[PDB]
Structure 1
């Protein structure tokens, strides 16, 4: 409902959302942009953003 409210016809969208007690999962990238969270795309994907990186033993040696 956040996405819809920000796209067009804010008034009607918000009224229907209030009536239907809607809940936004905060999963669309526009939603995350609105709330200041890493968008779920490109470098925002889970596999990418939580990568762990430690130097190998052979390199840690020298």
Structure 2
């Protein structure tokens, strides 16, 4: 819901997520940028880090 709420239609996605009680695993580029973590690409992946 974090990646879809920042694209379009914030109210609808927030309402659907609240009703469904969804959970976000924070495993994408946009979410890692939003919360302030290293993106999982390039030099931010486990082998190189």
Structure-2-length-normalised TM-score: 0.92
Gaps of 5+ in 2: none
Q: Which has the higher helix share?
A: 1
Which one scores higher on RCO, CA 8 angstroms, separation ≥ 6?
Answer: 2
CA-based RMSD: 0.6
Larger Cα Rg: Structure 1 or Structure 2? 1
Unaligned stretches of 5+ residues in structure 1: 49-62
Aligned length: 48
